[model samples]
Target: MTEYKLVVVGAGGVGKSALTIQLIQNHFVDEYDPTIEDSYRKQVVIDGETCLLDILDTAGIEEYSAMRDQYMRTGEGFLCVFAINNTKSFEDIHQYREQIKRVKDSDDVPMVLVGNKCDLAARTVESRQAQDLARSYGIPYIETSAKTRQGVEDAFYTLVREIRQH
Candidate 1:
């Protein structure tokens, strides 16, 4: 089994959320309240190899910076995300990643690559932008559409596998 941690702005979202809902239920919208909305599990196959994923899709818990440290501290791997339609969401991409890196204090700390709303093209942020960002940081990138349920599985599967590798 491969387990991983997940991240997203989880606050002040600009066209986010549809991706996560796509992956979980037929029509679902969950708020990641650690006290309640803890973790979920799924099975995925990568490279013809099967593994289980325990996902901590922490939507930042919408608290203070201290919460970030706490949330950032709790995972072996990360699943960072942003929406393609909103450049505002992408603006803080590096900050959250860097913050986690510093707080993590690990030479092996790595980033997860996630771009939501892949089904519909973006006005401000393009898929290329996310792809380039991931490349610059040496991370895996996943484009998803919660609208059509496309790439949702690939995102998490890649995330879990990458976590194991890193």
Candidate 2:
């Protein structure tokens, strides 16, 4: 019965679903239909201590300006995402974070900055830009490729650790 909720907030096509699929299902989802939703649970074992994640996977990051409020209402953390190949997707991270601060009203709430679709070489926002922004916000920035499962585990583990610390 112990669980924590996290929501994935990013623009459509940024690979939000794919990333989650990689984590929970261990596959890059070019396909699927397993009932994962804005509310889904992934059972995991952390440090010999059992844990379950209640995650909200959102396909709308905003106006991603406002893919904001609802997540804060339920999640203890939010994984704000963007595709590495998309500049507009990357540009909205700040707005997402801003809303987190205003809506959740907590600096210590755990969060992860995820750059998805990183396996592609044709990229617009390099990792440095995203890393720099993470530095400003003092949060963890993870680059992931849902297509290859690289960095996927890291993102979720990092967020879990952050949540525990806080």
Candidate 3:
């Protein structure tokens, strides 16, 4: 069986759990509460291709420096999620990238920058700014709405495609 491990890192309430839930079950949790949990795993099949996906959903806000390192080291791919409505979440991409780099010795691992909560355009952070950041890091970027299941599949499929290409 083909298996891949991915880690979702971001600040609290940034929709990490939402994205994970969407990708695994095609559903989203409307009212999510933040907690510092060890980890969670889910399996998903995209385009009829079955993949065992091990997802590590970290606490949104608190710094899990030790656990973060361990997660990144084992990840085959990464989805650095950020809230489009919160500039802080967007700005934290640098830290997340640095963490990945610290644990990942090679620069070849695929990464996707997700600007989540796209369903609420009225509260969108600067889309162009987020794009520029992702571009600078040579990562694909997309706005997603877990609440509405928008771009949910795209995020997962994009990472899978990138990994397969490599």
Candidate 4:
């Protein structure tokens, strides 16, 4: 089977693991910790193609700064995620994007801009802002709530589709 190596990146507390775990296990994780690194696999059919998804769930903490470039190099596609309720996390997306591009040495990388935690009522980042950012970057922006499984599959599957297009 074909495999897609997907990397999930975001600021801490933005629910990167939550989204990954939800996709892999179909259960939401309520509590989260700073991730060192985690890998998950799942086989699913997308557009009539059955492929294995090898996902690298990465850390958002500064302590793991040294390891960021390593995974970025291997990633076929990326999910740049941020919590909608947290402005800082949203702002951090730029850094992650730049790092991914720099590490990959390509501006045409496949990526999806994921706005997570949409289930929260107190959202600091509006949908328009995210949409505008995604537009400027020429990528799709998807709002997701890992807790409720909203848009979760779209986010990951979109990345896979993007990779296929590339």
Winning model by lDDT: 4
RMSD of each: 3.6, 3.2, 2.0, 0.8
Cα shift from native, residue 137, model 2 (Å): 0.5
Of 3 and 4, which scores higher on lDDT?
Answer: 4
Candidate 3 similarity to native, TM-score: 0.88
Candidates ranked by TM-score: 4, 3, 2, 1
Per residue, candidate 4 scores C-alpha lDDT tens digits across 14-54 of 99999999999999999867888889998999889999999
Give the TM-score (vs. native) of candidate 4. 0.97
Worst 10 residues of 1 by lDDT: 28-37
TM-score of 1: 0.75
Per-residue CA lDDT of candidate 3, range 1-166, in tens? 6887778888788899888887777777889677454455555676788778777777765654445566568887888899988888888888888878878887666899999998886565787888899899888998899999889889878887777877
Candidate 4 stretches greater than 4 Å from native: none
Across 60-124, the per-residue lDDT of candidate 1 in tens digits comes to: 43443345567557666766777777676677777767767876887566566777766666457
Q: Write the per-residue lDDT of candidate 2 for residues 62-109, one digit (tens) a residue.
A: 344344365566778888899999999889887777767777777767
- Candidate 3 weakest ten by summed lDDT: 35-44
Clashing pairs in 3: 11-60, 12-60, 12-61
TM-score of 2: 0.86
Question: Best by TM-score, which number?
Answer: 4
